[PDB]
């Protein structure tokens, strides 16, 4: 299980502040020696069950297998001592959802599209590795100080989930593509809530009736077209992540393609002379 993971000795780890919770233990911000490097640390505390131990070390195992620029990096694991720990890199900019809501309007279209290309490349890698994420959303993406997005999974999302996954529990890389389209909309809106104040039942009814999120403000036509393709009801009609990466790469490498904007439908019109 731990074959792509490095065992870290507990004397090299300092926990500082609680930043969240695991299934059976806290997540902390801390420091790792090997000068000191900031890390996030998920613990498994005394009394955990067999199933919790299997899921915890299984999680570390899969994270260790991933080696990609756009996937969170595992620094290592403590499995030989208690409490057990999963240790990852740390990003001062934090999670993408809060980041964009706190930086409204501060980036260029090219910067936003570049973020999406990195997320798509991480997802293409996961899908190729036969890993279905199931919870792709901006809240599960970390942003580094180069604006590079790292797909993560912080644990627990009707508004991000494809219809077949909601209806009959069919989670695949194609349901992850639906979620990616929602993430595109989150990025281009600077972290707006998908479907605004609609309830979960209202969202599913709207989707089943064929309604889809409208274009963000200032959004390239090509980007809105791409998110719309991610939201095809028929799973097989959605692009694969390889198609998404290819499209986004081509738009970035010919950036004039992003200057054509989709028409924004105003809710409110102001009359002025
Ligand atoms: C410690 C830790 C453990 C596991 C994971 C994680 O991603 N596992 C995972 C599992 C399956 C698939 C994938 C996937 F996607 F790669 F495929 C990834 C991330 C963190 N690391 C971490 N956890 C948080 N949390 C936020 C608060 O709630 C608790 C968690 N915050 C930060 N953090 C904040 C600022 N800089 C870093 N790091």
UniProtKB/Swiss-Prot annotation:
Q: Where does the chain bind ATP?
A: 19-27, 42
On modification after translation, the UniProt record reads:
Autophosphorylates. Phosphorylated on tyrosine upon binding and activation by EFNA1. These phosphorylated residues are critical for recruitment of VAV2 and VAV3 and PI3-kinase p85 subunit which transduce downstream signaling to activate RAC1 GTPase and cell migration. Ubiquitinated by CHIP/STUB1. Ubiquitination is regulated by the HSP90 chaperone and regulates the receptor stability and activity through proteasomal degradation. ANKS1A prevents ubiquitination and degradation.
Sites of Phosphoserine modification? 246, 269
Q: Where does it localize?
A: Cell membrane; Cell projection, Ruffle membrane; Cell projection, Lamellipodium membrane; Cell junction, Focal adhesion
Modification type Phosphothreonine: residues? 43
Which residues are modified to Phosphotyrosine? 28, 131
**Expression by tissue:** Expressed in brain and glioma tissue and glioma cell lines (at protein level). Expressed most highly in tissues that contain a high proportion of epithelial cells, e.g. skin, intestine, lung, and ovary.
**Record's superkingdom?**
Eukaryota
Record's note on what induces expression = Up-regulated by UV irradiation via a TP53-independent, MAPK-dependent mechanism.
Q: Which residues lie on this side of the membrane: Cytoplasmic?
A: 1-273
Q: Where is this region: Mediates interaction with ARHGEF16 and ELMO2?
A: 6-273
Q: Which residues form the Protein kinase domain?
A: 13-252
Similarity comment: family membership: Belongs to the protein kinase superfamily. Tyr protein kinase family. Ephrin receptor subfamily.
Q: How does it assemble?
A: Homodimer. Interacts with SLA. Interacts (phosphorylated form) with VAV2, VAV3 and PI3-kinase p85 subunit (PIK3R1, PIK3R2 or PIK3R3); critical for the EFNA1-induced activation of RAC1 which stimulates cell migration. Interacts with INPPL1; regulates activated EPHA2 endocytosis and degradation. Interacts (inactivated form) with PTK2/FAK1 and interacts (EFNA1 ligand-activated form) with PTPN11; regulates integrin-mediated adhesion. Interacts with ARHGEF16, DOCK4 and ELMO2; mediates ligand-independent activation of RAC1 which stimulates cell migration. (Microbial infection) Interacts with human herpes virus 8/HHV-8 glycoprotein L/gL and glycoprotein H/gH heterodimer; this interaction triggers EPHA2 phosphorylation and endocytosis, allowing virus entry.
The linked condition is: Cataract 6, multiple types: An opacification of the crystalline lens of the eye that frequently results in visual impairment or blindness. Opacities vary in morphology, are often confined to a portion of the lens, and may be static or progressive. CTRCT6 includes posterior polar and age-related cortical cataracts, among others. Posterior polar cataract is a subcapsular opacity, usually disk-shaped, located at the back of the lens. Age-related cortical cataract is a developmental punctate opacity restricted to the cortex.
This chain's function reads:
Receptor tyrosine kinase which binds promiscuously membrane-bound ephrin-A family ligands residing on adjacent cells, leading to contact-dependent bidirectional signaling into neighboring cells. The signaling pathway downstream of the receptor is referred to as forward signaling while the signaling pathway downstream of the ephrin ligand is referred to as reverse signaling. Activated by the ligand ephrin-A1/EFNA1 regulates migration, integrin-mediated adhesion, proliferation and differentiation of cells.
Q: What is this protein called?
A: Ephrin type-A receptor 2
- Give the species this sequence originates from: Homo sapiens (Human)
């Amino acid at each position: 299980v731990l074959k792509f993971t490095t065992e870290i000795h507990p004397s090299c780890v300092t926990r500082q502040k609680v930043i969240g919770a695991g299934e059976f233990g806290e997540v902390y911000k801390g420091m790792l020696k090997t000068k000191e490097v900031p890390v996030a640390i998920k613990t498994l505390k005394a009394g955990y069950t067999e199933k919790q131990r299997v899921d915890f070390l299984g999680e570390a195992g899969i994270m260790g297998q991933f080696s990609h620029h756009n996937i969170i990096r595992l620094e290592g694991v403590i499995s030989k001592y208690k409490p057990m720990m999963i240790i990852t890199e740390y990003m001062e900019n934090g999670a993408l959802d809060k980041f964009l809501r706190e930086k409204d309007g501060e980036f260029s279209v090219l910067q936003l599209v570049g973020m999406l290309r990195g997320i798509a490349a991480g997802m293409k890698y996961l899908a190729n590795m036969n890993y279905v994420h199931r919870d792709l959303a901006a809240r599960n993406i970390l942003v580094n100080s180069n604006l590079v997005c790292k797909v993560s999974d912080f644990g627990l999302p009707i508004r991000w989930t494809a219809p077949e996954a909601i209806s009959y529990r069919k989670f695949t890389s194609a349901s992850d593509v639906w979620s990616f389209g929602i993430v595109m909309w989150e990025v281009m809106t600077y972290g707006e809530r998908p479907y605004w104040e609609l309830s979960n039942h209202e969202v599913m009814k709207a989707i089943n009736d064929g309604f889809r999120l409208p274009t963000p403000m200032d959004c390239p036509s090509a980007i809105y077209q791409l998110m719309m393709q991610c939201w095809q009801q028929e799973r097989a009609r959605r692009p694969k992540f390889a198609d998404i990466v290819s499209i986004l790469d081509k738009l970035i490498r010919a950036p004039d393609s992003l200057k054509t904007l989709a028409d924004f439908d105003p809710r409110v019109s102001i009359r002025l002379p």
